[PDB]
């Protein structure tokens, strides 16, 4: 609809931390927590990669596993 | 040793892709392939996060694995 709620980065909030990730849709997405918001929402990884690269890196760094 | 300079990012090359990783020293390092150069170098992950975040992201994205 014309007046759909802004989502994700369109809301104009500062990203805080990525809570989780999923590629259900065939696009990789993150569940983003925003500063001073209790209302997390899904953003495209390609968008997060550009707008908050250090937040995306921190997510991946938290989830490094050494197979060998 | 003192004369092993320049190394890593100090070579002034454009990062192409991270091809490996190591933690043997306590600090995470990446094996960096530079555009147009056969010799890959070890660079601190903290430095790569600053200098070429998208390269870091691309590396992690390629190794993201889902579990069941």
């Amino acid at each position: 609809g014309a007046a759909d709620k802004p989502r994700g980065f369109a809301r104009g909030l500062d990203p805080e931390r990525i809570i989780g990730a999923t590629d259900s849709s065939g696009e990789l997405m993150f569940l983003m927590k925003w500063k001073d918001s209790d209302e997390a929402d899904l953003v495209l990884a390609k968008e997060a990669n550009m707008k908050c690269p250090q937040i995306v890196i921190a997510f991946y760094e938290e989830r490094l596993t050494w197979h060998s | 040793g003192a004369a092993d300079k320049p190394r890593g990012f100090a070579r002034g090359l454009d990062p192409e892709r991270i091809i490996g990783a190591t933690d043997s020293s306590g600090e995470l390092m990446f094996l960096m392939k530079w555009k147009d150069s056969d010799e890959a170098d070890l660079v601190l992950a903290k430095e790569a996060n600053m200098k070429c975040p998208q390269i870091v992201i691309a590396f992690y994205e390629e190794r993201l694995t889902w579990h069941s």
């Binding site: 990730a21 596993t65 197979h67 | 993201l64 694995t65 889902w66």
Partner: peptide, 15 residues
Amino acid sequence: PHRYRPGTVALREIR
């Protein structure tokens, strides 16, 4: 709607 999956970055120590 806000489910997410178990995912890690699978690295291989060089040493």
